[PDB]
Structure formats: structure tokens, C-alpha cells
Design a protein around this ligand. Structure first.
Ligand code: CL
Ligand code: CL
Lengths: 64, 65, 65, 64, 65, 65
């Protein structure tokens, strides 16, 4: 019965890659699929998982 | 600072100990399910059924303080 | 000292308890969706649909003393 | 629901960097993308994310 | 000398209820947009388009009732 | 509640007495002119020139307390 974070819209402009510390996917219970990027200062930004830059960011976060 | 929205997909079964609650809110209308969230003193966010008697009474207790 | 504008992108379904509401406001015409915001005694703010009968009745009750 | 803070205009003049405590990106639900700077005394100022000074302020906050 | 003056940058599309309005004024001609402001019994202020028929009817009623 | 936006069309000529100031804000970017508003203890809203040295120093005083 914990809340889970869901996204209902996406930032259009990519945020700076160097500011991003980690990412996660929102729960599949959520009505929309989403990636959440977490900044060094713990801003959380919803992103569209079908966008090329979101995929490049995730790939970079995971393999470097 | 965060543009995620907390949503609920289950309601807690046992009423929370009243003394552990410090605030409540209603989840956004964007969420698929309507819900009450009770925020505990340890800052757990607990989903609860808005129709339940004990939930309405807790909220009433917090608002009419 | 904020020049952000509070907007609503969804509404709560069930009327919240009348006795908890301290004031309302209409959101700005800048917002893409028209809305009412109810403010509770403890400053929860709840987005509500201006076309719903219960919303219009709550507003009326707050405006007529 | 809860309200979403949106920006419908931006401050032209950069505000003093030393007064700024934090920033956030407005929600993707908003019609106009924006940055909000929050001062030590909780003034909130709408700013244009494409402006260099805005990007540099954000970078300074994230990389500090 | 240098008081602020209220300006409107958008208008409420839905006419607000006529019975809630206690007075109106025009924003300053210095403002970039022309506007009527309706003031409710509870001192809510609502920007309105002075070219709209319902705004004129409201003003006429407020002046000649 | 307040659909209107406070805008400035003139800047006060004489620096306000610092002790009379309670807060400041920057006016909305919607306004045609950029401005600082000092809020006095009596709750007067005074428009002031953002480029003026004394204005920037008052603001700095208020933020850096
Ligand atoms: Cl997108
Ligand atoms: Cl209109």
C-alpha cells in the first residue's frame, strides 16, 4: 500500500547528461510508461522511454 | 523539484495507528484510482481507501484540529 | 513572492467534505484547463471541475456568507 | 488533485546567483517549458531554459 | 506615486455566477490588455474580456439594478 | 482569488526607508516593464527600478538575512 510514482507528461528538451546520477522506470501499474532521471541534487524528471536521447542516456548510465 | 505523481494501487487493510499519522492528502485526479495518503511520523506514505469510515474520520480529525 | 501560476490538469471525483473547505479560487485563464481549487482548513488544495453541480454548490455556499 | 505550478513568462534580467537556493523544471503538463529558481527567502522566479545564464545557473547548482 | 496596478493577461472563459459579484472595475489603460475585473462577495478577483456580451450584461446590471 | 497581476509603470524616485520594508518580489515577466516591488510594513506595494544600486542592496539585505 505504498504510493508509487507515476508520470503523466514528459519534459521535451533533454536535460544535461552530466547532471544525471541515476534513472528508474515507473511501475507498470502506472497508466503511462516512463523513465525518471534523478539529478545529483535529486531533482526527478519524467522522460519518454521511446525517445532516442532517453535511450542514449540510459545506455550511458549503464555502461560507463 | 520532482514531477512524478504519487499514485495508489492498493489500500492498507488494517487501520493505521492514529498516533503515527501527521498529515494526509488526496492523490491527484490523474491517478487511475482515487485514494487517501496518510503520511506517518517516519514519513511513510500509506495508501488508504477513501470510502472507509476510519479513513474519513482520521481526515476529519486532522482538518478540524 | 512567486510568479508561477497554479494550474489543474485533472479533477477529484468524489466531493470532499464541505466542512473541511475554507476557501476556493478559480484558476487563471492562462491555464489550459479551467478549474476550481478548494482550500481546506489545513491548506490542502484540491482541483475540482467547475461544471460539476457539487462544485458549483460549494462555491455558492462559500460566496453567500 | 493538487495544483501544478506553471510559467507563462520569464524574467529577462538574471537574478543574483548568490540569492538562489535551488531550481526545478516545471512539469511537462505545462504549455510552456520553464525553470523555476527558488531564492533563500522562497521567492520563485520563472526563467527561460534556453538562456545561457539560466543553463549556467542550473549547472552550478547541480555540480556544486 | 509608484504603486503597482493590476493587469490581466488572460480571461476566464466560463461566466462566473452573477449573484456572487459585488462590484467591478476596469484595469488601467497602461496595461497591455484591456480587462474588466469582477469582485466577488468574498473578494475573489476574476479577469474578464470587455468585448464579451455577458461581461456587458453583468456591468449593466451592476450599474442599473 | 487573484487573477490579476501587479505591474509597474513608474519607479519611486526617493529610496524607501529601509526600516519600512518587509519583503520584495520581482514583477511577473508578463508585465511590459521589469520591476522590483517592495512591500512596506503598512502593506503598500512600491515599484522600484531593478537596476538601481539601492534597490539591489535592499534585496540583497532581505535575501541574505
Ligand atoms: Cl517527449
Ligand atoms: Cl473570453
Amino acid at each position: 500500500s505504498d504510493t508509487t510514482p507515476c508520470c503523466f507528461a514528459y519534459i521535451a528538451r533533454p536535460l544535461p547528461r552530466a547532471h544525471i546520477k541515476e534513472y528508474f522506470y515507473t511501475s507498470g501499474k502506472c497508466s503511462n510508461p516512463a523513465v525518471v532521471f534523478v539529478t545529483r541534487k535529486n531533482r526527478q524528471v519524467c522522460a519518454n522511454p521511446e525517445k532516442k536521447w532517453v535511450r542514449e542516456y540510459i545506455n550511458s548510465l549503464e555502461m560507463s
